[PDB]
């Protein structure tokens, strides 16, 4: 149907905008601390601590399959990156501190993303 095509075009355009958002957020992680999944070979107890691991590569795979239906879903995954790190790692660590800085800098990007999503529909 044409209605299904139009819905698919909207999903495509949202995907484009989320890819730009994802790039901008990942730039706020210049140390690449959040670039890849925590390795269960290197941190074998991780899943006893963190029930829903997340990282930028994992988000990028979901995005490229058009797996985010709305901005809320995308934000959920970004917040997992930050919140998982702030639980597993202590306050005095470079990991925790990177997460705080990513959260604070990313908030700015996400504030304008939300306006764009709503504005363009």
The answer to whether the CB of 56 falls within 8 A of the CB of 22 is: yes
Residue 115: partners with Cβ closer than 8 Å, 6 or more residues away: none
Residue 105: partners with Cβ closer than 8 Å, 6 or more residues away: 28
d(CA 75, CA 72): 5
Both structure tokens of 53: 């691991």
Both structure tokens of 29: 């992680």
Find the domain containing 55 and state its range: 1-121
This structure's resolution (angstroms)? 1.5
Experimental method of this PDB entry: X-ray
Number of domains in the chain: 1
Count of CB atoms situated within 10 Å of the CB of 85: 24
Report the CATH number at residue 10: 1.20.920.10
């Amino acid at each position: 149907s044409m209605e299904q095509v139009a819905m698919e075009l909207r999903l495509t355009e949202l995907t484009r905008l989320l890819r730009s958002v994802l790039d901008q957020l990942q730039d706020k992680d210049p140390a690449r601390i959040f670039a890849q999944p925590v390795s269960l070979k290197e941190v074998p107890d991780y899943l006893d601590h963190i029930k829903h691991p997340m990282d930028f590569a994992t988000m990028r795979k979901r995005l490229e399959a058009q797996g985010y239906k709305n901005l809320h879903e995308f934000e959920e995954d970004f917040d997992l990156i930050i919140d998982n790190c702030m639980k597993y790692n202590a306050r005095d660590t470079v990991f925790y501190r990177a997460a705080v800085r990513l959260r604070d800098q990313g908030g700015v990007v996400l504030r304008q993303a939300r306006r764009e999503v709503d504005s363009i529909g």
